[PDB]
Structures are given as C-alpha cells and as structure tokens.
Amino acid sequence: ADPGPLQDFCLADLNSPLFINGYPCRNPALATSDDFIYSGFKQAPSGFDQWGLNVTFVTAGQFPALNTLGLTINRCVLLPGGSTQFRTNPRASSLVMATEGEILEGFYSTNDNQLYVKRLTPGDLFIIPPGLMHFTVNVGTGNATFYASLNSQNPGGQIVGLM
Amino acid sequence: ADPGPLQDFCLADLNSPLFINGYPCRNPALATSDDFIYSGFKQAPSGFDQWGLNVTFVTAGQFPALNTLGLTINRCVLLPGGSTQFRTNPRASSLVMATEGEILEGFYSTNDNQLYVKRLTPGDLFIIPPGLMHFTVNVGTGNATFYASLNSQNPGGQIV
Amino acid sequence: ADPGPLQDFCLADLNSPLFINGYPCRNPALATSDDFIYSGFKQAPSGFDQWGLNVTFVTAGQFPALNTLGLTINRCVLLPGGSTQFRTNPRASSLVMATEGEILEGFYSTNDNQLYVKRLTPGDLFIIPPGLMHFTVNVGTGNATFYASLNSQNPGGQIVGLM
Amino acid sequence: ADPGPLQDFCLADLNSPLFINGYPCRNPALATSDDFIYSGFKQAPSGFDQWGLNVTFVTAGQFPALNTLGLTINRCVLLPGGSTQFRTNPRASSLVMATEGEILEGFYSTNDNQLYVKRLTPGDLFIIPPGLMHFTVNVGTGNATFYASLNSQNPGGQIV
Amino acid sequence: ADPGPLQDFCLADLNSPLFINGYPCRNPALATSDDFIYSGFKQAPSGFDQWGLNVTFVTAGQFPALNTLGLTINRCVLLPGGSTQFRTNPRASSLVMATEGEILEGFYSTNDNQLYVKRLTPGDLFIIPPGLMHFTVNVGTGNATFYASLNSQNPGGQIVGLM
Amino acid sequence: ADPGPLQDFCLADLNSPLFINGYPCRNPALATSDDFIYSGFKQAPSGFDQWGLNVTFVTAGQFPALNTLGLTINRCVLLPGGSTQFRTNPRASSLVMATEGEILEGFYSTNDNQLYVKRLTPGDLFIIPPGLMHFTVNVGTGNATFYASLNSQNPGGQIVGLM
Ligand SMILES: *[C@@H]1O[C@H](CO)[C@@H](O[C@@H]2O[C@H](CO)[C@@H](O[C@@H]3O[C@H](CO)[C@@H](O)[C@H](O)[C@@H]3O)[C@H](O)[C@H]2NC(C)=O)[C@H](O[C@@H]2O[C@@H](C)[C@@H](O)[C@@H](O)[C@@H]2O)[C@H]1NC(C)=O
Numbered sequence: 001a002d003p004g005p006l007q008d009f010c011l012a013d014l015n016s017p018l019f020i021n022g023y024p025c026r027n028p029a030l031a032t033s034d035d036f037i038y039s040g041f042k043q044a045p046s047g048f049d050q051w052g053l054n055v056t057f058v059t060a061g062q063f064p065a066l067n068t069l070g071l072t073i074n075r076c077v078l079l080p081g082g083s084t085q086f087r088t089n090p091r092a093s094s095l096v097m098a099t100e101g102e103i104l105e106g107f108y109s110t111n112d113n114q115l116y117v118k119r120l121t122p123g124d125l126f127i128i129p130p131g132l133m134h135f136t137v138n139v140g141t142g143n144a145t146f147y148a149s150l151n152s153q154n155p156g157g158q159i160v161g162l163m
Numbered sequence: 164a165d166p167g168p169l170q171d172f173c174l175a176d177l178n179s180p181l182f183i184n185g186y187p188c189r190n191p192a193l194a195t196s197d198d199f200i201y202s203g204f205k206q207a208p209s210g211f212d213q214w215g216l217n218v219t220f221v222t223a224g225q226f227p228a229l230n231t232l233g234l235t236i237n238r239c240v241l242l243p244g245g246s247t248q249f250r251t252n253p254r255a256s257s258l259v260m261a262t263e264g265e266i267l268e269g270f271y272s273t274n275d276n277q278l279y280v281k282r283l284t285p286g287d288l289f290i291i292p293p294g295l296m297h298f299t300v301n302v303g304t305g306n307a308t309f310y311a312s313l314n315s316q317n318p319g320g321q322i323v
Numbered sequence: 324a325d326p327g328p329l330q331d332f333c334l335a336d337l338n339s340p341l342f343i344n345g346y347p348c349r350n351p352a353l354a355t356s357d358d359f360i361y362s363g364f365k366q367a368p369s370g371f372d373q374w375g376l377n378v379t380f381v382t383a384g385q386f387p388a389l390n391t392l393g394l395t396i397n398r399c400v401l402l403p404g405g406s407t408q409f410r411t412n413p414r415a416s417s418l419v420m421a422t423e424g425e426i427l428e429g430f431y432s433t434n435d436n437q438l439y440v441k442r443l444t445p446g447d448l449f450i451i452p453p454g455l456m457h458f459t460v461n462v463g464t465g466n467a468t469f470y471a472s473l474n475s476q477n478p479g480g481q482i483v484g485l486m
Numbered sequence: 487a488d489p490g491p492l493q494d495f496c497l498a499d500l501n502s503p504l505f506i507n508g509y510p511c512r513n514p515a516l517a518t519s520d521d522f523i524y525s526g527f528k529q530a531p532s533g534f535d536q537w538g539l540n541v542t543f544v545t546a547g548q549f550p551a552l553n554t555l556g557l558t559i560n561r562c563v564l565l566p567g568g569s570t571q572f573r574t575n576p577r578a579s580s581l582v583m584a585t586e587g588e589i590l591e592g593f594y595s596t597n598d599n600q601l602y603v604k605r606l607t608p609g610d611l612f613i614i615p616p617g618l619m620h621f622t623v624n625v626g627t628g629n630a631t632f633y634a635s636l637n638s639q640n641p642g643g644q645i646v
Numbered sequence: 647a648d649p650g651p652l653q654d655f656c657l658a659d660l661n662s663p664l665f666i667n668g669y670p671c672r673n674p675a676l677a678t679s680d681d682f683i684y685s686g687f688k689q690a691p692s693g694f695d696q697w698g699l700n701v702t703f704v705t706a707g708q709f710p711a712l713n714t715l716g717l718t719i720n721r722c723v724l725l726p727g728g729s730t731q732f733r734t735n736p737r738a739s740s741l742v743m744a745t746e747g748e749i750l751e752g753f754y755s756t757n758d759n760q761l762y763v764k765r766l767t768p769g770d771l772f773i774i775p776p777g778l779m780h781f782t783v784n785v786g787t788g789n790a791t792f793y794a795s796l797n798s799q800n801p802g803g804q805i806v807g808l809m
Numbered sequence: 810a811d812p813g814p815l816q817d818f819c820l821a822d823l824n825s826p827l828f829i830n831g832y833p834c835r836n837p838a839l840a841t842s843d844d845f846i847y848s849g850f851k852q853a854p855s856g857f858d859q860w861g862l863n864v865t866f867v868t869a870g871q872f873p874a875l876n877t878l879g880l881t882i883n884r885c886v887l888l889p890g891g892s893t894q895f896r897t898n899p900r901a902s903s904l905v906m907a908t909e910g911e912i913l914e915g916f917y918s919t920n921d922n923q924l925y926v927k928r929l930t931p932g933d934l935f936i937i938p939p940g941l942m943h944f945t946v947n948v949g950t951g952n953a954t955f956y957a958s959l960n961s962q963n964p965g966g967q968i969v970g971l972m
Pocket residue numbers: 044045046047048077079142143
C-alpha cells in the first residue's frame with residue numbers, strides 16, 4: 001500500500017527540515033553506488049530488550065535508498081528463552097525467514113483470534129498478513145535468528161500484549 | 164502495487180479452472196497452520212543454468228498463502244564464476260541480501276543507463292528499483308547465496 | 324488500500340461458491356434501487372459482549388453494494404461502564420463520530436506506544452490511523468453510541484488486549 | 487485511491503508555503519491528543535444556500551490529522567423543501583447515513599444514466615460509487631440531516 | 647487507481663458467466679500475438695448522437711488485452727457544430743490529443759467550477775483531471791477528431807449537463 | 810501505480826530546489842487555462858538516434874499539469890529502416906497507436922520470453938504490459954509514426970538490448 005515511485009529512486013533526506021508522507025529526497029543526480037548498499041547487519045546485536053529480543057531495523061529511516069521503493073527487512077535475534085511478546089506490523093505484511101535456531105511463529109486472525117502457529121527451523125518461511133497480532137518464541141538451543149521482509153518502507157511496529 | 168487484501172488471507176487455489184488477476188482462493192475456513200509455512204528452501208539447488216545460477220522461487224505459485232499479501236522471496240545460488248545475466252523484475256522492487264560468498268550487484272537507471280554497482284559480502288543489502296535492468300556476478304571463492312525480497316506476490320522475471 | 328473499482332458497482336454475491344480477493348459479484352444488470360440502501364441500523368443492539376459493547380457491522384458481508392467501493396461504517400453502543408478493550412482495525416483507518424453519551428477514545432502510536440486520548444461528546448470526531456491499537460470507554464451516563472467510518476469494505480477487527 | 491500513509495500520522499501543515507500532493511506535515515513529535523479530535527460539528531449550520539442546503543466540511547483542510555489517512559466525513563443539513571442539486575464527488579465513494587428527517591437519495595450509473603433512488607429515514611445507509619452524479623431531496627417535515635463518509639481526505643465536490 | 651496486475655497479462659473473458667471486479671481471464675497459455683492488437687479504429691464512425699458526437703470505445707470490454715493493464719483509448723469525432731455536452735470520466739484522468747480539425751476543450755474544477763478551457767489544433771494535448779466535468783465543442787470547419795487516453799481499463803462515461 | 814491525486818490538479822514546480830516522490834507543485838490558485846494545454850507535438854522531430862528513432866516526450870517533466878494525474882504520451886517517429894532496439898517502460902503499461910507508416914511491434918513475456926508481435930498500420934493499437942521488453946521496427950516505406958500512451962506521469966525508459 002506504499003505509494004508508487006514516480007522516478008527511478010529518491011534517497012531519503014533524513015536531515016531535511018520538512019515533514020511529508022514518507023521523506024523528501026536528496027538530488028538524485030548526486031546518488032552514487034554507495035547509496036544503494038546497506039551494511040548494518042554486519043554489526044551484531046548490541047543488546048536485547050527485557051524479553052530477550054534484538055531487532056536491527058532496515059527501514060527508509062536507516063537505509064535512505066528504500067524511500068519510495070516499498071520494502072523493509074528487519075533482523076530479529078532471540079536469546080535462549082526469548083520471545084517477541086505479542087506484536088503487530090500495522091502497515092505491511094511480514095514474510096519471516098528463519099536462519100538460525102528454532103522458533104515458534106504464529107499469528108491470530110480477525111475471526112475470534114484463531115491461532116495459526118508453526119515451529120520453524122532454518123530455511124523455513126512464514127507469512128504474517130498485514131496488521132495481524134503475531135509472536136515469535138525461541139524454542140531451540142542458543143540464539144534464534146530470523147529476517148522479516150515487509151512490503152513497506154516503514155511498516156511500523158507495536159507491542160500489543162505481553163505473555 | 165499489488166492489489167490490497169480484502170480479508171485476512173486468501174490461499175491461492177492453484178488447481179482452479181478459473182483465471183483472474185492473481186488467483187482464486189481456497190475456502191479460508193479450511194486454512195490451517197500448515198498453510199502459512201513454506202519449507203522449499205530446505206531443498207538445495209538441484210541444478211544450475213548454463214551461467215551457474217540456480218533460482219529457487221517462492222511466489223504465490225509455490226506458496227499459496229502469499230496470495231493477496233504482496234510479498235515474494237527468491238533464493239539465488241551462484242556457482243564460482245557464475246552470473247545472473249542481465250535481468251529485470253518487471254513488477255516489483257528487489258531487496259537483495261547476500262548471505263554466503265561475495266558478489267557484484269548492480270542496476271542501471273533510466274537516465275542513460277547509469278550503472279550503480281557494489282560488492283556485497285554476507286549481511287549486505289542492495290536495493291534494485293522496480294523494473295530496472297540488473298545483474299549479479301559471483302566474485303568470491305565458493306558458492307554465492309543471496310535472497311531477493313520483492314514487494315509482489317508475483318514480480319515476474321525476464322532476461323534482457 | 325482497497326483495490327480500485329473497475330466498473331460502477333459490483334454487488335457482493337454472498338452465496339457464491341467461489342472465494343476471491345473480496346467477493347464475486349452478481350450481474351450488475353440485475354441491480355435495483357433496493358440494493359443500494361441498507362437499513363440494519365434500525366435494529367437496536369440485540370445484546371452486548373461481556374464488556375458491555377455491541378457492534379452492528381456494515382461491511383460488504385452485510386451490505387453487498389459496498390463491494391469494491393472501499394467503505395465501511397460500524398455502529399458501536401456501550402452500556403454504562405462498558406469498554407471495547409484494546410482493539411485494532413488491521414486494514415483501515417477509523418474515523419469515529421460520537422453521537423450519544425460521552426466516551427474516552429484513544430490510540431497508541433508505534434513510537435513506544437505514546438497514547439493520544441480525548442474525551443468525546445456527541446458531534447466529536449476522532450481519527451484512528453490504520454492498524455493502531457485503540458480503545459473506547461464509556462465515561463458518561465446511560466449508553467454511549469458512536470459510529471466508525473473505515474476506508475475499507477472489510478477492515479477487520481481484532482481484540483488485542485483486555486484492561 | 488488516496489496514497490497510503492508511510493508513518494503513523496502526518497498532520498497537515500495548512501500554513502506551509504509549499505504545495506505538494508496533499509499537504510506537507512507538522513513535526514509528528516509535536517502532535518498531541520488535541521490534534522486527533524475535531525469538534526466542528528458542534529456548530530450548527532450558520533446558513534444555507536439558495537436551495538436550502540448547508541454542508542459542514544471535514545476534510546484534511548479542516549481536520550489536519552486526516553492528512554494521509556484516507557477519510558472524510560461531511561454533515562449535510564437540508565431545510566424543508568431543500569435539495570442538493572446534481573453533484574459529484576470526483577475522487578471518492580460516498581456512504582450516506584441519514585440521521586434526522588427523510589430524504590430521497592439517488593445516483594446515476596454510467597450505463598445510460600440509470601437512476602437508483604431510495605427514500606432514507608434515520609438509520610438508513612446509501613452508497614454512492616465514486617464520481618457518479620447524485621442528489622438528495624428533503625421529502626420530510628422538518629430539517630433533514632445526513633452524514634457522508636468518503637474514502638478520501640479530500641474527495642472534492644462539484645455541482646454538475 | 648486500477649488494481650495492479652499480478653501477472654504479465656490477463657485477457658478479459660467476455661463470455662464468462664462470472665462477475666468480479668473487472669473481468670475473469672482466459673487461459674494465458676492460449677493467448678496469441680493477435681490478442682494484443684486492436685483494429686477497431688479502422689472502422690470510420692458509423693453514426694453520431696443527437697449532438698454530432700461519435701465515440702469509438704476501446705476499453706477492456708472491446709479490447710480484452712487491456713484487462714488489468716490500466717489503460718483505455720477512445721476516439722471522438724465531432725461533426726461541424728457538434729459538441730459532447732458536459733461529461734465526466736468518473737474513474738480516470740483523460741489526456742486528449744487533437745488530431746484533425748479544431749476544438750474548444752475545457753473542464754471545471756471543484757473550486758466553484760472555475761473553467762480551464764483552451765482551444766486545440768492538431769498535435770495539441772489537454773489533460774482532464776479524474777472525474778471533473780468537461781466538454782469539447784467543434785469550432786473549426788469539417789470534422790474534428792481527437793483521442794482520449796485514460797488511465798483505466800474502464801473509466802466510465804456520464805453525461806452530467808446539456809450545454 | 811502512480812499515487813492518487815489529493816486535489817484537482819498540482820502543476821509540477823520544475824524550478825523547485827526540493828526533491829520528493831514526483832514533483833512539488835505550484836500554487837493551484839495561480840494555474841490558468843494555458844497550464845493544461847501542451848503543444849510540444851507541433852514541433853517535428855529535430856533529430857534521430859543512431860538507429861533512426863526520435864522520441865518526443867510528454868511526461869510531467871515537460872507537461873507540468875500531468876503531475877499527480879497518472880498519464881504520459883510519447884510520440885515516436887522512425888526513419889526508414891529505423892528501430893527502437895529492445896526497450897522497457899519500467900513503471901507503466903504502454904498503449905501504442907500507429908498513425909503513419911507501418912511498424913512491427915512486439916513484446917516478450919516473462920514466460921521464457923515468448924514473443925507477442927503484430928504488425929501495425931495506421932489506426933491499430935497494441936498494448937505492452939508494464940516493464941516488459943519490447944520493440945518496434947519500421948517495416949514500411951517512409952517514416953513511421955506512433956504514439957505511446959502510458960499510465961504514469963513518468964514511466965521511465967531503458968534500452969535493455971541491441972537487436
Ligand atoms: C547471541 O547473540 C549475542 C549477540 O550477537 C552474542 O553475544 C555477543 O558475542 C560476541 C562474540 O561472541 C561478543 O563480542 C566479543 O567481545 C569480546 C570481549 O568484549 C571480544 O574479545 C570478542 O572478540 C568479540 O568482539 C559480544 O560482546 C556479545 N554481545 C552481547 C550483546 O552479549 C551471544 O554470544 C554468547 O554470549 C556472550 C555473552 C558470550 O559469552 C559469547 O561467548 C556467547 O557465545 C549469542 N549467543 C550464542 C549462544 O551464540
């Protein structure tokens with residue numbers, strides 16, 4: 001549901017004094033190859049929340065080249081015993097790929113909160129419809145790592161309940 | 164640019180005799196937890212094209228639960244010396260994450276085909292705007308693996 | 324974010340054996356004036372949930388002419404002491420109009436769940452961004468009534484927390 | 487058909503010197519609870535046009551918090567004998583709810599202007615597809631009041 | 647505002663008994679090159695309305711390959727003294743190109759119907775925003791021909807006034 | 810896929826120092842009738858590329874009134890023996906109308922590049938789905954002229970192969 005792009009690219013000007021839907025852009029003539037790579041995932045999680053989750057975000061706020069292009073990827077690492085609590089992504093679907101460890105991944109539908117839940121091991125994909133309450137719990141040994149691909153440059157994230 | 168969903172989910176009925184924009188759906192009341200997991204990536208590449216590329220596709224055609232939900236992920240594995248050739252994804256952006264090996268990833272803009280190209284190592288991301296000509300070359304020692312996340316259930320792919 | 328209409332109207336065929344995004348339609352040549360009125364709100368709430376809320380829904384599931392046209396209105400009645408609990412509308416904004424009694428209406432943003440809350444009396448409007456956790460509490464005398472206008476034929480509704 | 491929002495909210499800066507599709511926004515960090523309520527409907531109609539209609543508008547121009555969020559509600563009050571004349575909402579559907587009095591509400595399709603018209607009494611809803619010519623006539627004894635919910639922050643209005 | 651296509655093409659099955667938003671499609675495997683050409687404009691206008699206008703329509707109803715692809719072209723020919731009356735295209739912009747003769751082309755805005763009117767000679771373009779009341783009158787000698795490009799497979803057309 | 814317009818019109822301010830998705834706009838109160846006509850097609854092609862193609866562009870970059878309104882028209886003239894090479898329009902469908910001369914027009918699908926090719930004479934239409942590789946070659950005598958209608962204010966254009 002992100003607005004369609006009206007040109008090739010439009011790098012977010014993160015220090016603009018203006019506020020618009022999304023971000024104003026830098027001069028596209030000034031873009032270089034370096035603007036289209038993002039290397040943030042090379043930094044390991046620097047900490048975890050009280051529930052054992054670290055999220056490393058890659059939205060247009062972190063990766064200016066994502067502006068207008070409709071995509072986000074977030075890396076989630078769960079300590080042993082860690083969980084996400086109940087969360088939503090208000091403005092995007094989330095396609096989860098497990099890459100390390102083992103997790104319980106589930107979402108609740110809008111039909112009396114019917115729960116669709118599966119155990120994921122590395123390689124597994126799990127799709128979360130937009131805005132629906134979901135969770136991840138680490139059920140394996142060591143850390144669990146998964147990547148969420150979302151169809152918005154800024155899906156948003158909200159903690160909705162605790163466990 | 165995928166049409167927005169008008170309900171929670173709508174699993175593609177791949178055996179329907181009808182043809183519509185996207186796919187007709189199975190009865191949502193019959194959907195189970197098993198319908199929202201996809202395990203295709205656990206199968207290693209079974210072969211490679213003449214250029215050393217294997218693509219393992221996860222569109223709504225392979226993962227029915229993606230129907231109406233606007234996302235695709237593809238796994239690409241390149242043998243040493245492998246290349247993707249020049250390709251487009253006509254109907255989606257592509258966000259590439261390198262996970263193994265090292266690649267050259269680039270795309271051409273519509274302004275005299277200016278080339279934006281970078282070396283990617285595991286962890287790096289590279290964004291290809293929708294429809295733009297792009298390529299990947301394996302410049303590392305072993306196999307290169309990267310995943311393309313696309314904002315369509317069926318972005319399409321074309322060698323140009 | 325509802326798909327745009329590709330013709331004047333497309334009345335939901337609610338007894339179709341097919342399932343598609345949205346609803347298949349009846350033959351538009353068979354539509355009559357009666358198909359574009361909906362009188363469900365003339366029935367008073369027939370009951371309330373354990374927390375004192377009655378919702379009378381008008382989505383495309385109840386009002387076939389809404390199919391493809393991107394709108395829903397729901398009537399909410401709260402008994403004295405009643406509340407909605409914490410809820411989301413996953414796929415639409417919600418514009419609330421209070422018409423009877425007095426309510427506390429609020430939503431939480433995705434920025435550390437900052438709460439935006441106001442007391443509403445009849446005539447007041449309050450806008451809930453899409454997918455964001457929100458609530459209504461009856462703080463007046465007697466029943467509270469408000470109408471939610473949503474920009475989807477089927478916004479969805481999910482109870483996300485209790486109070 | 488309103489562009490999707492790219493953040494939680496984006497209050498219209500109505501005093502901006504810039505002009506863009508929609509409105510530039512105020513700093514979201516400065517938004518308060520007061521920004522998400524609108525109390526304009528507490529003012530009764532201050533006057534009526536020659537045809538006995540008063541419209542009290544709530545678009546993003548009046549209610550800045552509606553900016554990017556895709557909704558509008560307008561209150562229409564018709565004096566006895568009043569009428570709206572033939573009008574369109576070019577960029578949105580209109581879902582009409584009658585709340586006081588009795589009205590004739592109708593719209594014309596694009597198929598030889600077939601007329602779909604119904605009598606509405608309080609509680610009734612009537613849906614007008616986007617852009618289609620429509621009208622309301624007061625057929626009751628007192629004032630008629632109805633609210634139009636539209637799926638745009640700025641649907642537009644035109645007498646045709 | 648047409649829904650985005652979810653595949654390469656989707657030729658309208660005009661003989662389907664089903665009704666959905668837009669059209670159900672033929673088997674894309676059966677599509678041939680001939681399905682993507684439309685030659686209706688080789689037919690001259692066969693008649694004119696009360697007022698001297700002939701419209702030759704190319705929507706998805708006439709050109710099945712337009713289904714899901716978001717475009718329509720209409721050819722309009724005006725006899726001497728002919729006019730369109732006041733009309734709207736409810737669901738699309740219209741980009742008019744004059745190719746023969748001379749016309750007065752105008753639309754009214756929603757701001758108290760301010761009139762934007764220009765007269766066009768062959769080669770000229772004039773843009774009509776979506777849904778806005780507009781008209782064209784033949785002000786030259788002989789026939790006037792112009793083509794309307796619209797960003798919908800089925801923009802719709804309505805006479806709204808009589809001029 | 811162009812973002813929907815949020816007002817009647819929004820003429821591109823091409824002299825703005827700002828960069829956003831699309832274009833910032835001039836004050837709509839200053840717009841006049843002349844802002845909605847574009848006469849660029851009155852200029853004949855001033856030159857041709859290596860290969861005998863001239864494109865006269867009418868995007869929002871040339872015709873500011875197209876901004877937010879979702880349409881573009883391009884005129885293409887091919888010298889004898891001329892061709893476009895393999896090209897894409899990344900962000901729009903293209904509806905081609907041949908008006909002078911004779912052309913071979915084709916596009917390749919994403920299904921192993923199956924070729925859909927037709928030859929066109931004046932009046933014929935041919936639809937190119939968005940982003941798909943396509944070409945036109947002049948196969949008649951003299952100049953060939955066709956107009957491309959695209960459902961974007963800035964579809965973009967890319968040479969993808971050399972034929
Ligand atoms: C789960 O994931 C966390 C975060 O990635 C791991 O903790 C991190 O481990 C890094 C490497 O093991 C630590 O960096 C090292 O720091 C030392 C001294 O400062 C350096 O000499 C060394 O070269 C590295 O740079 C990093 O400090 C640490 N980060 C955090 C936030 O804790 C964690 O690893 C496990 O826990 C830590 C506390 C150590 O005991 C590790 O040995 C141990 O593996 C991951 N857990 C598992 C089971 O893999």
